[PDB]
Amino acid sequence: MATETNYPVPYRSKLTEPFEPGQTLIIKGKTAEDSVRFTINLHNTSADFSGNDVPLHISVRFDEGKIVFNTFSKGEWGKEERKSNPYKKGDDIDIRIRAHDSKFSISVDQKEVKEYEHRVPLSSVTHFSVDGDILITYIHWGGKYYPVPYESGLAGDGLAPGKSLLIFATPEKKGKRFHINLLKKNGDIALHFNPRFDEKAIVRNSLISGEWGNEEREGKNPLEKGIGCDLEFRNEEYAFQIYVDGERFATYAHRLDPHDINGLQIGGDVEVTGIQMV
Numbered sequence: 001m002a003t004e005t006n007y008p009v010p011y012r013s014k015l016t017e018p019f020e021p022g023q024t025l026i027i028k029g030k031t032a033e034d035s036v037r038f039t040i041n042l043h044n045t046s047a048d049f050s051g052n053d054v055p056l057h058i059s060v061r062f063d064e065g066k067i068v069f070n071t072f073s074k075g076e077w078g079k080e081e082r083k084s085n086p087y088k089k090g091d092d093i094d095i096r097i098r099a100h101d102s103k104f105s106i107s108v109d110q111k112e113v114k115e116y117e118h119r120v121p122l123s124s125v126t127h128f129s130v131d132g133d134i135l136i137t138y139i140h141w142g143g144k145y146y147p148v149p150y151e152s153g154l155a156g157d158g159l160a161p162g163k164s165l166l167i168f169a170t171p172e173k174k175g176k177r178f179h180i181n182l183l184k185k186n187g188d189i190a191l192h193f194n195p196r197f198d199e200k201a202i203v204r205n206s207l208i209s210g211e212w213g214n215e216e217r218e219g220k221n222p223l224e225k226g227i228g229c230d231l232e233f234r235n236e237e238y239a240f241q242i243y244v245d246g247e248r249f250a251t252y253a254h255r256l257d258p259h260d261i262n263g264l265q266i267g268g269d270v271e272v273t274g275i276q277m278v
């Protein structure tokens with residue numbers, strides 16, 4: 001209701017392909033002190049008809065103080081399922097919906113709060129809409145089931161200054177530690193990002209010619225077992241700017257010339273749900 005900008009509401013988007021197991025839909029926005037409610041719908045339709053079926057309807061109610069889930073099909077609504085609404089009028093919201101074969105897992109502020117079993121085909125979801133008292137500031141749909149240990153190459157130029165590698169993951173509930181390596185062609189690790197819960201610290205280092213370097217820790221681990229996190233590795237001219245959940249966690253001065261960072265590896269006790277180059 002403030003600055004239209006991107007994603008103005010009523011917002012609607014036709015998916016390029018049907019929503020599939022794995023795959024997450026992320027919605028972030030701002031609310032006003034007078035916001036009453038907003039909705040997020042996964043639905044069916046041709047491309048302008050609208051309605052039809054709504055496999056998953058999410059209603060965030062500030063008046064009722066609840067988040068409500070339901071399904072509409074064959075012209076009828078089923079029985080609503082509710083959870084408490086942790087948000088107060090005003091303040092930002094972060095809701096994420098990941099599809100699985102037997103249900104949708106919905107997280108609020110990166111915390112799992114609802115498991116909604118499919119009532120109608122997940123495949124009938126061809127669009128998603130957002131409407132109501134919310135100023136959308138971020139939307140993204142994609143990802144998949146990333147096996148871990150994970151391993152792959154990066155684009156053509158890969159990670160170069162001016163670019164950033166965005167990773168969505170959730171440290172495992174009973175995990176001790178995990179790591180992410182940004183590698184160069186010859187196999188050297190430009191950056192080793194290694195959160196260690198058993199040591200309450202995130203270790204950063206580089207692997208050059210089979211040798212581990214100095215090693216930088218300290219900064220207070222901002223991650224939490226079982227809680228989702230948004231990791232951003234901003235490659236800059238003099239260093240990597242490491243962002244955790246929107247806040248700069250650390251800076252890591254380059255030990256290997258940046259440029260040509262074309263490899264990625266992820267291992268340890270962690271679940272990866274999204275990887276993207278921005």
Ligand SMILES: CC(=O)N[C@H]1[C@H]([C@H](O)[C@H](O)CO)O[C@@](O[C@H]2[C@@H](O)[C@@H](CO)O[C@@H](O[C@H]3[C@H](O)[C@@H](O)[C@@H](O)O[C@@H]3CO)[C@@H]2O)(C(=O)O)C[C@@H]1O
Pocket residue numbers: 179192194203205212215
């Ligand atoms: C007293 C001592 O020698 N400490 C050495 C430690 C310990 O052997 C280690 O912490 C025991 O778990 O190892 C040191 O080098 C480690 C460090 O580079 C970390 C950084 O993540 O990597 C360790 O190897 C990891 C590997 O990277 C993972 O992929 C996986 O294989 O786990 C192994 C460890 O089992 C290095 O051993 C260290 O500083 O911690 C060197 C210390 O001298």
